[PDB]
Design a protein around this ligand. Structure first.
Ligand SMILES: *C(=O)[C@@H](C1=N[C@H](C(=O)O)[C@H](SCC(=O)OCCC)[C@@H]1C)[C@@H](C)O
Length: 351
């Protein structure tokens, strides 16, 4: 008769054991009679033994910088076997917490990229991407692209199809993100794509036309950026919306007391770039709207049209500006992702 065999997922004396996966023990030619795992302090980890008694596994999160001791005994018809193993888990120099947008259970527009922002610079971008699992339904090709050292975005080639489920599991706990930086925790979010809403601002007509699934539902006279501070052409993703907000030029780099500086309270503001472009209420320019550009770059519209926009446009909806004397909105603006050519985005920039 054969003596029971014990196999563990870790080796006695191991160091740098990653904590992204459970620790397990398996018996062969017998079953597991006793398994305990204990940290340096003496506290048990505990986990669960399978019903057939063949596999034990931890069931809670294992900690960084721990010395664990595993003790296991297997019993079989042919006798007994016991083993003791001590190992040390990863010791991070730093932890980083990821933050994901959009919010869990949200419904968003067809332009919304998956956004994962880390609170620390990521030295190994590849390791981060590999730890992020995106499920789409219906399935669609997409890719990762970094806007800066901390935030990565994922999107398809073209605007999402309405009705698409998107699931984002950021599995960075126990993952080495480079230079001793490990993930502080896992995060998980899920969202759904809603109606196709695209609003086009044509500088030739100075009308902002809102299309819902192809049909015009609103036509808003607008005043865009005056020639000296023009509105950039391109595709903008709708971000946050505000019943009212103080626009502070210093937020976007420009001292208030300077020529292009400003600090003004405005109503019904919908953000469409990080660089500070908003659709908002502009009572002072209702006579210019539909005729001449007078703003610092914002899409000035009437109070009721700004409120309409606030009520009817959602995060991830699309604003496209065309035929202005500006250039093109930067691809790495923060809400300019769609202006990056697919061949470039798809190639990514992890290295
Ligand atoms: C957008 O253009 C910016 C924001 N909107 C405006 C604007 O009218 O362009 C303000 S300036 C308002 C001002 O100087 O006096 C208040 C009424 C005339 C501000 C510049 C920013 C967020 O891009």
């Amino acid at each position: 008769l054969l003596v029971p065999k014990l196999t563990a997922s870790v080796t006695d004396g191991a160091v740098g054991v990653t904590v992204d996966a459970p620790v397990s023990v398996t018996a062969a030619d017998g079953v597991l009679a006793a398994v305990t795992m204990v940290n340096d302090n003496g506290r048990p980890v505990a986990g669960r033994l399978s019903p057939d008694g063949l596999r034990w596994s931890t069931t809670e999160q294992l900690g960084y910088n721990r010395r664990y001791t595993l003790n296991a005994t297997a019993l079989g018809l042919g006798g007994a076997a016991t083993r003791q193993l001590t190992f040390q888990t990863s010791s991070p120099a730093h932890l980083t917490m990821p933050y994901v947008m959009p919010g869990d259970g949200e419904v968003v527009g067809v332009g919304e990229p998956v956004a994962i922002r880390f609170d620390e610079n990521i030295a190994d971008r590849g390791a981060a991407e590999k730890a992020i699992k995106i499920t789409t339904n219906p399935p669609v090709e997409g890719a990762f692209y970094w806007l800066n050292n901390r935030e990565v975005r994922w999107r398809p080639e073209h605007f999402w199809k309405p009705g698409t489920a998107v699931d984002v599991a950021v599995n960075t706990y126990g993952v080495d993100l480079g230079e001793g930086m490990f993930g502080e925790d896992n995060v998980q979010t899920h969202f759904t794509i809603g109606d196709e809403v695209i609003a086009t601002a044509d500088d030739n007509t100075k009308i902002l036309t809102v299309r819902v699934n192809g049909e015009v539902v609103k036509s808003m006279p607008t005043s865009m950026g005056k020639d000296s501070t023009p509105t950039a052409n391109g595709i903008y993703i709708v971000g946050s919306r505000y019943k009212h907000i103080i626009m502070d030029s210093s937020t976007y780099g420009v001292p208030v007391n300077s020529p292009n500086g400003y600090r003004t309270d405005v109503d019904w503001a919908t953000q469409i770039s990080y660089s500070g472009v908003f659709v908002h209420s502009a009572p002072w320019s209702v006579g210019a709207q539909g005729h001449t550009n007078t703003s610092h770059g914002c899409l000035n519209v009437s109070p009721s049209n700004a409120q309409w926009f606030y009520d009817h446009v959602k995060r991830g909806d699309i604003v496209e500006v065309v035929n202005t004397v500006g250039g093109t909105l930067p691809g790495i603006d923060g809400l300019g992702d769609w202006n990056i050519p697919w061949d470039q985005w798809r190639a990514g920039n992890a290295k």
